[PDB]
Design a protein around this ligand. Structure first.
Ligand code: RW0
Ligand code: RW0
Ligand code: CL
Lengths: 305, 305
C-alpha cells in the first residue's frame, strides 16, 4: 500500500556523470562508451549567449581546450563534433561503468527521473514529467546544465532529457540526447517564455485509478459521459483533450478496477466542479497529473483493495 | 528555481542489496563487508508469524538453511546471529562495493531516502519522513521487507531504517540497522495500529521559507507572535510543539529571507486559522511537513555527493 512520486534507482546514471570545462564555463557531461555528451553552450562566454554562432565558436577550439574530469581523473579529449544543441567529445577511455542504454525522445505527458548534478557530481534524484508546453518543472540551480533525465524499464537506461536552461517563470527547458530541443526553445539568452500550460488529463485519470486500487472510491458517481462532452468540459479547466489513444491506454487499469474509462471521466468532471470538500486523494488536495498509466501499473499492486 | 521532493542518489546503496531466502520466505538483505543484514522474520513461516519464538526458531537453523543471492551469484553463509529484530548472516565474501557507512537512529521529523527492493533488486527511490507516531508513509508491496532508508553526507552512507511491515492503515513500520523498532511495534502478525499522528511544525516552517526563497510571499504579514502564543495555536490543530531548538535551527533560513521565525509563525497561525483561500504554496494546497530545514538549505544551495 501507499503511493509516492517514485524515481528509478540512479546508480547506473551516477557512474556516467562527468565535469566538462571550456575556458571559464563548467557544466555536466554524460560519459557513455568513449563519448562525453554535454550542452553545446559550454563553449560560450556570458557575452556569447545573446546571439551565439556555435559553428564559428567551435571552429576556434581544439581538443585540449576541453577539460573533462571523471571523479578525480582527467580524461583526454581526442575529438569533438556538434550534433544539434549537443557537443560530443570523443575521449581516449571508454567508461567501464557504461550501462546498457538507448536514447529515446519522449512525448508530453511522459515521466522520467532526473539526476540533478553540479560539477559532475550527483546531488539528488526526483521524478518529473514533460509538460504539454514542453517544459519540465524541475529543481535546478546554476551549474546544473548537462544533468540528465531517464527511465530504467528492465535493466536498460533510456536517456530522454539533457538540461540546458531555466526560463523566466522558473521552469526548465532542454533537449533529447541527440540535441533536439523539446519545445520551441533555443539555446540563446533571448526573450523566451513557456507557453500557457495545461493539465495532463490521461495522467489524472491514471492517478484516480491508482486511488481506487488503494481503496478510495468516495469520488466515483453513477454517471457516464461521451468522450466529446468530457473534452468540452475539461478544456474549460485547462485540461488537455483526451484522445481515443488515451482511452485505449487506460484499458488495463479500467479492467483491474471494473470502472469504464468514460465512467472515470464522469468522476473527473464532477471533481473539477465540486473540488474535494476537505478530502484528499492519495495524500493530495489537488488532482495529480505527473503519474502515467504505466507508472501506476508499475507501482500499484495487481490486486484492487 | 523549483522545489521537488528529492532523494539522495541511490548508487552506493544499490551495490549492497541482496536476496535472502530461508525455506519458503524470501526478502531483501543489506550486504556490508562480510555481513548480510535482514529482518529476523525471514526464519518464520506464515504459522510462526502469529506467535514466533525467534530464539527457538533460530536454534533449529543451520548456515545452509539461508540462501543469499547477490545478483546472479550465490553467497555462502558461514555464520548467523540475531541482534534485536535483525538477523546477521556472516558470508564468505566481503562486498567489494561496500561504501563508507554508519548505522544511525533518527528522530521523528527527520527525513531519509528509501530504496524500495524486491528479490534483492532495487525498483525505486523516494523520500519520506519518520512521522511523530514513528511510522513512515511509504510505498511498499509484498516482498519489500529488508528495503533500507538512508542519508548521505559527503561519501558516507548513514543507514537509518530497515523495512519490516505494513500496518492496517497502509502505513509502514521498521527498525534501525541495530534491529530496534521505531515506535511501539513488534515483529509479529498481531493486532497493531498506528497511533494518532501530528504535523511536523518545524518542517512546515522550513517549507514556508522555501516558498519565500522561490518567490511566493502572499502568506506573509506584518504581525509577529511569541513561542507561548503560537504553541497554544499549534496544539489546537494537531501540530507538534515548536521548541527554542526548532527556532535556532531555522536561523539560517530566517537570515536568508529576512523573516524572523516568530514572524513566519504568525503567517502559519493565520494559514491554520483561515486556510489558503484558493491559493497554493509550491504547487500544494496542503501545508507540507516532509522537508526539514536542512533539506531546504541543501536543495536551495546545490550540495553534491
Ligand atoms: C535563469 N537564467 C539565467 O539567469 C541566465 N541563463 C540563461 O538565460 C540561459 C539561456 C540559454 C541557455 Cl542554453 C542557458 C542559459 C543559462 C541558464 O538558464 N542556466 C540555468 C539552468 N538551470 C537552472 C538555473 C537556475 C538559475 S537560478 C535563477 O536558480 O540561479 C540560473 C540559471 C540556471 C544562463 C546563462
Ligand atoms: C499487510 N500485511 C499483512 O497482511 C501481513 N503481514 C503482517 O502483518 C506482518 C507483521 C509483522 C511483520 Cl515483521 C511482517 C508482516 C508482513 C508485512 O506486513 N509485510 C509487508 C511489508 N510492507 C508492505 C506490505 C504490503 C502488502 S500489500 C497490502 O500491498 O499486499 C503486504 C505485506 C507487506 C505480513 C506477513
Ligand atoms: Cl513517450
Amino acid at each position: 500500500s501507499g503511493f509516492r512520486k517514485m524515481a528509478f534507482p540512479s546508480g547506473k546514471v551516477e557512474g556516467c556523470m562527468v565535469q566538462v570545462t571550456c575556458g571559464t564555463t563548467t557544466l555536466n557531461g554524460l560519459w557513455l562508451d568513449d563519448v562525453v555528451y554535454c550542452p553545446r553552450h559550454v563553449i560560450c562566454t556570458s557575452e556569447d549567449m545573446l546571439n551565439p554562432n556555435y559553428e564559428d565558436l567551435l571552429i576556434r577550439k581544439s581538443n585540449h581546450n576541453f577539460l573533462v574530469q571523471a571523479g578525480n581523473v582527467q580524461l583526454r579529449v581526442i575529438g569533438h563534433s556538434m550534433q544539434n544543441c549537443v557537443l560530443k567529445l570523443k575521449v581516449d577511455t571508454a567508461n567501464p561503468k557504461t550501462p546498457k542504454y538507448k536514447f529515446v525522445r519522449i512525448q508530453p505527458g511522459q515521466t522520467f527521473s532526473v539526476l540533478a548534478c553540479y560539477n559532475g557530481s550527483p546531488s539528488g534524484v526526483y521524478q518529473c514529467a514533460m509538460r504539454p508546453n514542453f517544459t519540465i518543472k524541475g529543481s535546478f540551480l546554476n551549474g546544473s546544465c548537462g544533468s540528465v533525465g531517464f527511465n530504467i524499464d528492465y535493466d536498460c537506461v533510456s536517456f530522454c532529457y539533457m538540461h540546458h536552461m531555466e526560463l523566466p517563470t522558473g521552469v526548465h527547458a532542454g533537449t533529447d540526447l541527440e540535441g533536439n530541443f523539446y519545445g520551441p526553445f533555443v539555446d540563446r539568452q533571448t526573450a523566451q517564455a513557456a507557453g500557457t500550460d495545461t493539465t495532463i488529463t490521461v495522467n489524472v485519470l491514471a492517478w484516480l485509478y491508482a486511488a481506487v486500487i488503494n481503496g478510495d472510491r468516495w469520488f466515483l458517481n453513477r454517471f457516464t459521459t461521451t468522450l466529446n462532452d468530457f473534452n468540452l468540459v475539461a478544456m474549460k479547466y485547462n485540461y488537455e483533450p483526451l484522445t481515443q489513444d488515451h482511452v485505449d491506454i487506460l484499458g488495463p487499469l479500467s479492467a483491474q478496477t471494473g470502472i469504464a474509462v468514460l465512467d472515470m471521466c464522469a468522476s473527473l468532471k464532477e471533481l473539477l466542479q465540486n473540488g474535494m470538500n476537505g478530502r484528499t486523494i492519495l495524500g493530495s488536495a489537488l488532482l495529480e497529473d505527473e503519474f502515467t498509466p504505466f507508472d501506476v501499473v508499475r507501482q500499484c499492486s495487481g490486486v484492487t483493495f
